[PDB]
Amino acid sequence: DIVLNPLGVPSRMNIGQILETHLGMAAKGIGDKINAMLKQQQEVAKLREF
Amino acid sequence: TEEFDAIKIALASPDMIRSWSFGEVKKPETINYRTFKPERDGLFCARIFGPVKDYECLCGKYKRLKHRGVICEKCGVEVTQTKVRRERMGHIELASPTAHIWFLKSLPSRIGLLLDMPLRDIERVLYFESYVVIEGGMTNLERQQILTEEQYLDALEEFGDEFDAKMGAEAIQALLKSMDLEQECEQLREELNETNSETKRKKLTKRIKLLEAFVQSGNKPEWMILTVLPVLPPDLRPLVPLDGGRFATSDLNDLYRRVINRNNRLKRLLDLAAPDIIVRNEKRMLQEAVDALLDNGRRGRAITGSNKRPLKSLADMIKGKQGRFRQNKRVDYSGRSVITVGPYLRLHQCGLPKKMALELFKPFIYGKLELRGLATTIKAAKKMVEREEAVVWDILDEVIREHPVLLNRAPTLHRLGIQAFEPVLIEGKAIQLHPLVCAAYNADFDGDQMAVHVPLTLEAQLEARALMMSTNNILSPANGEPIIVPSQDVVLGLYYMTRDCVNAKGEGMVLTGPKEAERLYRSGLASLHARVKVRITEYEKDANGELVAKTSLKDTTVGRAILWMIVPKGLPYSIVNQALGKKAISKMLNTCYRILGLKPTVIFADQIMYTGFAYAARSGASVGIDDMVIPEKKHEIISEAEAEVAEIQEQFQSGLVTAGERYNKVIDIWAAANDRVSKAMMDNLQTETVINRDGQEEKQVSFNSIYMMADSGARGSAAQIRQLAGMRGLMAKPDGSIIETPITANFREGLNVLQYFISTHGARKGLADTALKTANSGYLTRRLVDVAQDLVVTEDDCGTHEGIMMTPVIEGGDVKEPLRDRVLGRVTAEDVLKPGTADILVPRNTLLHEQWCDLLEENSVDAVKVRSVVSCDTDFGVCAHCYGRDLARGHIINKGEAIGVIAAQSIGEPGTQLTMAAAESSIQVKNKGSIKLSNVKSVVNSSGKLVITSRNTELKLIDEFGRTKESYKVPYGAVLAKGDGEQVAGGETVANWDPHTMPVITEVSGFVRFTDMIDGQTITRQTDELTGLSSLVVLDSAERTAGGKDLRPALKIVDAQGNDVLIPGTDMPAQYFLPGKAIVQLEDGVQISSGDTLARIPQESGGTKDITGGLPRVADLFEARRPKEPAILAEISGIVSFGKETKGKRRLVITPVPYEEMIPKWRQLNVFEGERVERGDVISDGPEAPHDILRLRGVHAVTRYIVNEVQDVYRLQGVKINDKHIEVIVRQMLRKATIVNAGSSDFLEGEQVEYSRVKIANRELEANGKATYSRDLLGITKASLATESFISAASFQETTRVLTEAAVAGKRDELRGLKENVIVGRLIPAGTGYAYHQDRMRRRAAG
Amino acid sequence: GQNMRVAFMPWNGYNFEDSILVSERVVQEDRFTTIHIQELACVSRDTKL
Amino acid sequence: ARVTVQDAVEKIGNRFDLVLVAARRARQMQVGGKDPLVPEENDKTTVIALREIEEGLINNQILDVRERQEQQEQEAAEL
DNA sequence: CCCTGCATCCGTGATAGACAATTTAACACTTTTGTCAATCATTTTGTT
DNA sequence: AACAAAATGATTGACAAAAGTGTTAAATTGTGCTATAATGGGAGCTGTCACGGATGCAGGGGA
Ligand SMILES: [Mg+2]
Ligand SMILES: [Zn+2]
Ligand SMILES: [Zn+2]
């Protein structure tokens, strides 16, 4: 949904964004792993395990 | 109004101020408060400043169009336009005189030095505190004695007549009125000759020069005491009614009401006959109100009523707001928006939104809709454009067929900040802009806006297409380097396209041209960078502009072939065969300019941008968190220097080492560990990949996407990669001192709080300078472009045979600039030949373009004599050949071009980014060549060494071709190695000297004579036996104590019989003054040899933080400030000799082969008693100011000093600027000359050099000589004041002092300039307007 | 603000400088659409006419 | 259309009267004087002026002789 | 009995109550436009 | 093959019709007064810096 430029990180030394862009991906990785489990309505025993 | 010229200014007499005005303003009231019509005889009258409503009287008896000139009888308004209420003037009739606060309180009091009266006494008379006599006659009183209240009253009882004393402003009108400028003029022409005083007969000629102005000008003296103050017109100080009832008055109707009220009362007290304690307090109160009007602030600052800010008088309206009141002009037909990218455009077009272009081009659109008959009348076209009917969107597109617009960004530094463009209508609200040009404006695309203008007339949209178009400016004017280099993203596209892997898809196959190499990669077989063999036909222009094919089998990649299909014909294939970084693209456009001209290079500079952007998108060049590789040995490199420093702090613990050698030893142990991390990191990024062949493994250059952006030069370099992976340096606290512990973690691991608070500082000093370097460099380029304003190429060739010599700069063992890049694009005054005689290769004066340089590159010339613009002989400008070659274009500089202002911007546009192993033991050069030394007088000694004498020993390491390679300097304490013609080994010392000591080596030995170095008088008595050391410091000229000051320290070397042994090659015996800081080991009693070191003079040079420079040096260099410690010079080459001493400071003599000049006592001289000195040679030590250089060595001497320092602040920052630009400011900086002889000028004045050379070329040209001058040198701030005009000075400098001095003399500004010619609003005389000025001076004085 | 799936890569020069590209799925869903509320005032003074 | 006047300076080598020469010929085609010599291609009057100069059909000398005849050519109407 | 040498200083940057002469605005009207009709010529449907 | 007649422009003065130059009444504007004892002095300010050119003291150095 956006296409930033990678020639902004070498000069401007903000390596925050390139780390928030990964941890922002692991968090939304759990998002699609629960949204599938909750969509087959597996159980309230499987959710509490994950 | 006719073609006027020569605005003329002078004083105004009360019979003239009564002639502008149309009536007397005799009440303080303004309007009526009930019906807001203005009252009669008040400030806002209608009988005085004309009517209010257009074409009708005030009462209401004359409205018809029949009565159009009559003046009404009820209220005498003249029925005319209400515009005439804007250019009439009134006048108040003062009931008593009053001094003009400008001509009374301006620092040289023009009322003062016209009477020879101390200004503190005139002020004691204008307050009615002390009488003053007039016409004393036969009594004990002069004409201007200051009788106090008693002394007059103690004088008045004796005499009643033959005597007149006055007091107050009506007295100075009596002194001036009777004084005669002819009697005391010639009578002072004699008094100046009798007076013998360098101060008296220097100010004496100042007064007599003022009296000589008040006569030929035509101004009487007593016009500087007002008697009718004129009032402004009532529409330049409006009383407009705001919305809601309040009015918004100007701040002058508060000051005029305060004079007309006080003046109106003082009319009454002379009819009611009050005592003289009140009316004498009235005039003192009026005169403070007239002087609060002219220039309020030089008094008690009569702050506004009903508010607490000071009022704003008349002279606070012209006075700088940083610039003029007139034109130094907000503008119609404009706009502004947020720029964006739009990379599909050609080079010569920019987007322009429909919603804007429909609003700037409105009056044009009205033309079509009434021309094509679509609208009947103009009112019916205004309603068709408001509806946005679907027809106007097709008429608006034909109005914008070829109509160039002008984009311009806000802080316009240089001339490339304004460029035209041909618009193309897009939809949106952002002004798109071609990416190549965004580096000229210096525009990032993160919110920067850009105005757009519109050239209206028919000559104004050709000047926006011939001169200003965006495809004409591909060479920046500051230097020939391009300005359309593909900047940031494309340059990484091409670098990725033209590399080579080691084993990719389809390696070793052989292709059949660029067309097969492309489609082979598109289909998917071969990789974009895989080694391959193609066949490519390159062209080559070798005849008179013809091309020839040459087919062969080049060995390349697949990437380079695809890029070969873009390059035009004339270029060779060794231009796209390298790795193609960013330094190689920038030249690949340059060679395409010098060869194929500008038609293909503008269309080749776009095929790069379309190819770079394309193949970077397929690259997928992303950056991650594992791209930045941390080295594995970072721990060991950090722990060793961690422990190794823990064991030096102990050495200070047990008191072994002092702290200063504790601190600097800890700094240099971290710098070892800080540099073993970069060298341990970059060797891990560079050779990252190790890929395999079909057989073994072999390594290459990496493909690390955070290295590729550093090696291409796309963005950032190893000075910043070192902080993402390596260790993050060591920081400085606010003093400027380094902290002991460096921040030891990069930006991939965290920085704990105490490491971040340390780093947080440097981001504050970083921002508090860039916020200031703009405000500071914005004032250095505002002065350069106001001294160099009026300079213009105004002749095709001058004729003068006098130039300068352009020797390449020599930086010890390195060259700062090659000889070629300094002399490219210039004429040649004397045709140099081959070093063999009669080998004239470069002819008489010709342009040194890209070939005649390399022709002189093939040969072995070491210097050329080029024509510089500081020596041209033209009047008012410079010829074409003298200036030279440079332009955005490549031709010679066209006649008429305005080189003045494009030279002051090339020096000011930098600076915004230019804000600001130290051992020195052995003279080790990279070369081996003969040594040719000049300005030396040295002798071999018994030590087997050519003995050193002074610091005139420079070591010119001649190369194999008759040139110079390296320059050095050999001071005392320097033992020499080789001779003359015998070389020196690779990195070997022909001469070694003492770094840590400046010793004196023994020329002649013998016993020692205590010559003014006796114990106690020069240094207290200390005993030291046969070992040969001591603790005795022979102090020097500025390091000597107080007691025995009748001595000059030196130990007289004596011969075998007892005489003072002499210096070989001179007259004086050996009296070798041991310089300061000298712990002299040589005490008498022991015999020494000839060739021993006499005393230590230490010199550490550890740290090297003892240098000036920066941006203030460039401003402090042009202004020519005397640097607090100047170096003396030799006014005449003769014999050295001294005289009477200890007058508080020493003295000296100079005599031809008498000239007497003193010398203070602080400086260790650099001369001997028996010496023949060269004129203007260093007699002492000090950074000599520019004034002394010009007075002695010549005009080319002060030029080559300024041009070499100011070029020494930039080149150490990497800023290219041609030194032609710093010579059209050293020309405009010394155009004032003072006279010596006479015949037409008065022998001590100051006149412009053009004047002295138009008489001397005229008077001496006629049958009688009937002068001699001396060049002067003044800063850019004082040299832009003394111009001939008075508008080019009053515009930018202090204004209160340039109108006062011009009004007294009655100047006549002849409008021959630029900044004096844009004010009046006409064609500036340089550029497209210079042509029509050829016809205006060719019209007057003839038909 | 909103948080949207971002990718670091140079795309065809449409993000040359610091500028940004944007998909049209961020305009359809209306996640960046803000609301503004102006104000206009019309006073009717008491003139002397 | 015209993008660069590099060709139209090869005739008039100055670049500062190429404006003057072509800003004056470009007026004759706008205010009712004359018509273009070269064939127009749906262009304005400035670009057609800069396209004649390239063809040598116009320069600062021709425009004088070309129009100084008009007085003599009007001299038949001048009687 | 006479010049050169610091040093202080200033500027330009960056607490209420009768008089009168006065002014507008009002009501009043003459000339200037708007009808508002009867003679002076130009004709007036098709029989005299 | 020429006007029978029936208006109809063109043509006269006449009721009307509106609306602009001088009298009264209301208001605004202003002028001159008013007699316990009152007697110097109200009055604000600040954290810039650097360069330059006088006006003055100063006292060193020469008749
Ligand atoms: Mg920006
Ligand atoms: Zn009137
Ligand atoms: Zn010249």
According to DSSP, residue B541 is labeled B
* DSSP conformation letters of B433-457: --GGGGGTTT--TTT-EEEEE---S
- Residues whose CB is less than 8 angstroms from the CB of residue B1121 and which lie 6 or more positions away in sequence, other chains included: B1185, B1275
DSSP percent split of chain C into helix, strand, coil, nearest 5: 10, 10, 80
State the Cα angle at B430 between B426 and B431, rounded to 5°.
75
Residue A10 near chain B (CB below 8 Å): yes
| Smallest Cα distance from B853 to chain A, Å | 39
Axis-axis angle for helices B1195-1210, B1111-1118 (nearest 10): 170
Q: How far is CA D31 from CA A14, D8, D25, D27, D28, in A?
A: 62, 23, 10, 6, 6
* Closest residue, chain C, to B244 (C-alpha): C45
B1161 touches strand F (CB under 7 A): no
Please say whether the beta carbons of B111 and B99 come within 8 A.
yes
Q: In a 10 Å sphere around its CB, with 0-12 CB exposed, 13-18 middle and 19+ buried, how is residue B452 labelled?
A: buried
Please say whether the beta carbons of B679 and B722 come within 8 A.
no
Radius of gyration, CA atoms only, chain A: 17
How many whole angstroms separate alpha carbon D5 and alpha carbon B983?
58
Inter-residue long-range contacts of B1236-1242, CB under 8 Å, 24+ positions, other chains counted: B1236/B1267, B1236/B1268, B1236/B1269, B1236/B1270, B1237/B1267, B1237/B1268, B1238/B1267, B1239/B1265, B1239/B1266, B1239/B1267, B1240/B1266, B1240/B1267, B1241/B1267
In the 91-150 segment of chain B, residues within 7 Å (Cβ) of strand E are 105, 107
- Residue B1051: which H helix or E strand, with range? strand B1050-1053
Radius of gyration, CA atoms only, chain B: 40
CA–C1' nearest nucleotide, residue B1277: E13
How many whole angstroms separate alpha carbon D43 and alpha carbon D52?
13
How many whole angstroms separate alpha carbon B231 and alpha carbon B314?
11
**For residue B345, what are its two tokens?**
């455009």
How many whole angstroms separate alpha carbon B908 and alpha carbon B778?
8
Cα B884 to chain centroid distance, Å, stands at 21
| Exposure class string for A15-42: b at 16+ Cβ within 10 A, else e | beebeebeeeeeeeeeeeeeeeeeeeee
How many whole angstroms separate alpha carbon B85 and alpha carbon B1003?
93
What CATH number does domain B931-993 carry, 2.40.50.100, 1.10.3210.10, 3.40.50.2000, 3.20.20.70? 2.40.50.100
| Exposure class string for B1091-1130: b at 16+ Cβ within 10 A, else e | bebbbbbeeeeeeeeeeeebbeebbebbbbeeeeeebbbb
- The residue with tokens 């408060």 is B33
- The residue with tokens 């006409």 is B1322
**For residue B632, what are its two tokens?**
């594995």
B963 touches strand E (CB under 7 A): no
How many whole angstroms separate alpha carbon B950 and alpha carbon B1181?
13
CA proximity to B575, closest of B585, B566, B739, B583: B585
Report the topology of domain B633-764: Topoisomerase I; Chain A, domain 4 (1.10.132)
* Number of residues assigned to chain B: 1343
First to last CA, chain C: 54
Cα D33 to chain centroid distance, Å, stands at 11
Size of interface B-D (CB pairs under 8 A): 73
In units of Å, what resolution does this entry have? 3.7
How many whole angstroms separate alpha carbon B527 and alpha carbon B6?
75
**For residue B246, what are its two tokens?**
């309040």
Please say whether the beta carbons of B1319 and B324 come within 8 A.
yes
Radius of gyration, CA atoms only, chain C: 22
How many whole angstroms separate alpha carbon B976 and alpha carbon B496?
55
CA proximity to B517, closest of B562, B556, B552: B562
**For residue B1058, what are its two tokens?**
């007892």
| Three-state SS at B735 | coil
SS3 letters for B779-840? HHHHHHHHHCCCCCECCCCCCCCCCEECCCCEECCEECCCCHHHHCCCCCCCCCECCCCCCE
How many whole angstroms separate alpha carbon B136 and alpha carbon B142?
6
Phi-psi group of B981: left, alpha or beta (phi > 0 → left; psi -120 to 50 → alpha; rest → beta)? left
Axis-axis angle for helices B599-617, B490-497 (nearest 10): 80
**For residue B481, what are its two tokens?**
């380097």
CA proximity to B1083, closest of B1036, B1038, B1037, B1018: B1018
Other beta carbons within 10 angstroms of residue B143's beta carbon come to 14
Q: Rounded to 5 degrees, what are φ and ψ at B725?
A: -110, -50
| Three-state SS at B1170 | coil
Closest ligand to C-alpha of residue B442 is 1
Q: How was this structure determined?
A: cryo-EM
Measured between beta carbons, which residues in chain B are less than 8 angstroms from residue C48?
35
Chosen for mutation from B32, B36, B37, B341 (greatest number of chain C CBs closer than 10 Å) is B341
Cross-strand partners of B959:
none
* Chain F nucleotides covered by protein, CB below 7 Å: 28-29, 51-56, 60-62
Please say whether the beta carbons of D56 and D11 come within 8 A.
yes
Cross-strand partners of B1011:
B1050
How many whole angstroms separate alpha carbon B898 and alpha carbon B789?
9
Q: Rounded to 5 degrees, what are φ and ψ at B228?
A: -140, 105
How many whole angstroms separate alpha carbon B346 and alpha carbon B960?
52
| Three-state SS at C27 | helix
Closest ligand to C-alpha of residue B51 is 2
Inter-residue long-range contacts of B184-193, CB under 8 Å, 24+ positions, other chains counted: B184/B211, B185/B211, B185/B212, B185/B215
- Give me the residue from B435, B614, B622 closest to C16, CB to CB: B435
Q: Rounded to 5 degrees, what are φ and ψ at B425?
A: -75, 120
According to DSSP, residue B474 is labeled -
**For residue B294, what are its two tokens?**
């002219």
How many whole angstroms separate alpha carbon B485 and alpha carbon B583?
10
| Exposure class string for B210-248: b at 16+ Cβ within 10 A, else e | bbbbbeeeebebbbbbbbbbbbbbbbebebeeeeeeeee
Strands B865-866, B939-940: parallel, antiparallel or unpaired by DSSP?
unpaired
Residue B493 near chain C (CB below 8 Å): yes
Please say whether the beta carbons of B195 and B201 come within 8 A.
yes
How many whole angstroms separate alpha carbon B112 and alpha carbon B101?
12
Integer distance in angstroms from CA B1128 to C1' E2? 28
User: According to DSSP H, which parts of B14-156 are helical?
Assistant: 14-20, 102-105, 112-115, 119-122, 149-156
